[PDB]
Design a binder for this molecule. Structure first.
Ligand SMILES: CN1[C@@H](CSCC(F)(F)F)Nc2cc(Cl)c(S(N)(=O)=O)cc2S1(=O)=O
Ligand SMILES: CN1[C@@H](CSCC(F)(F)F)Nc2cc(Cl)c(S(N)(=O)=O)cc2S1(=O)=O
Ligand code: NA
Ligand code: NA
Lengths: 475, 475
């Protein structure tokens, strides 16, 4: 019985798009489109995908240099800068993936808890819901992923169709002439007067700054290494990984642009929500854009004390849509898919690190064979860390450190491509057309600049952990 | 004719105390003693001298390992971590010393300009005074230092006696019962009631924070490598450098403690300066500590709008003193001595780098022999940079970068001592008693933590310059 291999659509493209897409697409992008306007949000998106396209070109070059087993993303780091950084960056990549599993399972459990709190009775605790649901969900994900990889691929296809159904739902919803309940909350159909007004920024609050929007959005656009972490499970990686990875980046970027430019042309930033703010003939005069449509939000705007509209309501995308439960289904398929992708990625990197003769730090973890063609000893190690960080359940002070563990890998991958190309390393002959050393160097510099520019003490902790591991291995 | 050698008093101790002592001793320490109180200022001082004592122990260990020529402070960095960091850290040490020459000559020229603006007519420009005076002063310093090193040593002894005379002046001044002019500005003799009141903090203003006081004070306590940069000009460095360096640190620390604890027991933080704030019998009641001595500063304290007292007047030390011109003489001897020490240090490191066969980057600078036993080609290179940065004359936005160039050297010296001691390097047998690897490691970590904690973008620029030099040498 031969093992199973995947094509470039179900092996690289679907996985990369599903790992890129998260809950920012549903819960924060329409709000970023309000704080910053349409054109400046487009600039945010295009500045964020510039780093990931350069990293994608370095990854595509690495893939056209030979055959690499699954989880060997750090082999060029260890081959170009020594096996003590390579193993340490591999061990920190695999740990960040396992903590990302917990950060996505917590996000799924929060949605389920909010869903339960509205329909019926919860359990006695408000925050132990997030713990029980998180543990049961990660155990179900572990079961499906440990039952083979065809089942994991079928689950990923299910999540992809759920997300496409949510997109079609929202797009049909924006085309229906408004009802009273929608129009009172700020939704008007595609209008020429709302497109123009929403093009320019309107900053409000403590985080209402261009750098704050960049900080919220940038970490969500990463996730382009999901198809390259299973390179040994593909029919032919040297054609699959470049094409799939770059098509995934292109199409997620187009979806991000279309959603912002269409939400910004339908919903005004301020609305009351109550049904008796229609025009009263002879009410002197009213101020606001919606007056010409028949609504009066003057009291809100003057007092700044109502909770609807594009800039006040985080759930505006769910109400523009034709049927609201399908957006919740999309959120489920967007968080579970990323948790599953991160779990598979962490398991395979851990399994590659446990069988590394040049990095013998953690090779002692295996006692039972677990020879069922699956990384059982990398699955249990990822599951243990994921459950431990789910029990904590408060992960918003740990997210910067985990997100800098991912930019250290980006910096070292790009610099290893540059260092191997300028030194004429003996055995580095990439055949990808659109690769160039100076682009890789720029990516390596920008990754570290962004690392320190997001939060400097988290960057210090990340580099300190890398250094402690590297020096403990040497001594 | 043999060359001249110096003992441990005139070669290490005087030079180190004169480079440590600057203008913070005269113009900012009495104000730090007001913002933070006596005990918390003592904590500031003892936390700052903890880093420099550990670095002094590493330097003393380096000095008891053989004979090193003058300027070879980076030889252990290059011997323990490769000749591409050693030369780069040497080249950045020598450049920071030459910029420090300009930062001290500008401080001398500012004092002379203020002195001239009060007595007579200046030249037509207010800021070109600082340029003409700076250039002429650095040329005179270059002349005396290029005329041999006995003359430089005699100038240093002159500066030391001037500083001691200023200290005796101030200490006699604090013991004289107050006059009307002094008592009106806030000076009362040693009182028990003012010691107690001044022990606890009183924060005011934007920089009135413990971290702000630390930021102002810490960079001034460094300067402990002035006696180790001329190690090849001493009778026997292996006994001279440890004893002199540690005695210098000890005595400058004791002077810093005594000045703060005696200025804090004499001057109240708020005073008016005008002579008719004495007690009027029957003026209801007055609020403040000085009332029991016969003065009334209620209007000031309520309105926060007068310019005398320990926390408002930067020149309080000059008015407590018996004769005021001697404090200005002390300021002259405190800035010129540091400029001369930095110029000699930069010249000798540049001359050691120009004769290095393992770091051939700048060995091309020498055409004329200049064989008069003096680093002529390291003197002219230091003089050119000093004059170029004096012409700019605005150096308070460059000081953080230059001050991080000095903490990078501290971090790499300490880490090179640790790395050589744990690896059992072949030829590293220090015979200093009070050396220990873990103290050196702690010093190396604390230096980088402080580097990033003072100002993170300046630390990024410093590490980026080091990295650019290191990588340009490798490729
Ligand atoms: C959305 N993710 C962000 C981190 S944001 C949440 C945080 F972890 F920061 F808390 N970065 C990456 C990067 C990669 Cl490369 C991969 S992956 N599976 O391709 O290797 C996965 C992720 S992610 O899914 O965790
Ligand atoms: C008072 N100085 C501070 C820097 S504060 C002013 C700034 F430069 F930051 F702008 N640090 C050092 C360190 C050393 Cl080691 C030496 S020296 N001659 O021993 O090598 C001299 C100096 S300093 O005199 O420049
Ligand atoms: Na997803
Ligand atoms: Na001095």
């Amino acid at each position: 019985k031969e093992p199973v291999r995947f094509g470039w659509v179900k092996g690289v493209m679907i996985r990369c798009m599903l790992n890129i897409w998260g809950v920012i697409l549903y819960l924060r992008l329409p709000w970023i489109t309000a704080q910053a306007g349409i054109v400046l949000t487009w600039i945010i998106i295009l500045l964020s995908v510039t780093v990931t396209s350069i990293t994608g070109l370095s990854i595509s070059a690495i893939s056209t240099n030979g055959k690499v087993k699954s989880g060997g993303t750090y082999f060029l780091i260890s081959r170009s800068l020594g096996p003590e950084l390579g193993g340490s960056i591999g061990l920190i990549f695999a740990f960040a993936n396992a903590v990302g599993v917990a950060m996505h399972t917590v996000g799924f459990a929060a949605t389920v808890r909010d869903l339960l709190q509205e329909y019926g009775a919860p359990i006695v605790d408000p925050i132990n819901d997030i713990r029980i649901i998180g543990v049961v969900s990660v155990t179900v994900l572990l079961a499906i992923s440990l039952a083979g990889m065809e089942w994991e691929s079928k689950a990923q296809v299910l999540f992809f169709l759920v997300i496409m159904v949510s997109f079609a739902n929202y797009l049909v919803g924006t085309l229906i002439p408004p009802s009273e309940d929608k129009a009172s909350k700020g939704f008007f159909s595609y209008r020429a007067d709302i497109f123009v007004q929403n093009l320019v920024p309107d900053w409000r609050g403590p985080d209402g700054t261009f750098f704050g929007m960049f900080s919220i959005f940038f970490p969500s656009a990463t996730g382009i290494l999901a198809g390259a972490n299973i390179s040994g499970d593909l029919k032919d990686p040297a054609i699959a990984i470049p094409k799939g990875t770059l098509m995934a980046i292109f199409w997620t970027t187009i979806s991000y642009l279309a959603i912002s430019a269409t939400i910004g042309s339908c919903v005004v930033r301020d609305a009351s929500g109550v049904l008796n703010d229609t025009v009263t003939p002879g009410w002197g005069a009213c101020e606001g854009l919606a007056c010409s449509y028949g609504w009066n939000f003057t009291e809100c705007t003057q007092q700044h004390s109502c909770h609807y509209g594009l800039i006040n309501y985080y759930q505006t995308m769910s109400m523009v849509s034709g049927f609201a439960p399908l957006i919740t289904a999309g959120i489920f398929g967007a968080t579970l898919s990323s948790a599953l992708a991160c779990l598979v990625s962490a398991a395979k990197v851990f399994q590659c690190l446990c069988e590394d003769q040049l990095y013998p730090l953690i090779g002692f973890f295996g006692k039972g064979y677990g020879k069922n063609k699956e990384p059982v000893r990398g699955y249990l190690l990822a599951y243990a860390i994921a459950v431990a960080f789910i029990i904590i359940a408060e992960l918003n002070t740990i997210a910067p450190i985990i997100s800098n563990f991912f930019l250290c890998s980006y910096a070292l991958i790009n610099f290893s491509c540059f260092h191997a190309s300028i030194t004429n390393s003996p055995g580095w002959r990439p055949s990808f057309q659109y690769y160039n050393k100076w682009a890789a160097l720029f990516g390596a510099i920008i990754s570290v600049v962004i690392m320190f520019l997001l939060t400097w003490w988290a960057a210090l902790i990340a580099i300190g952990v890398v250094l402690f591991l590297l020096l403990y291995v040497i001594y």
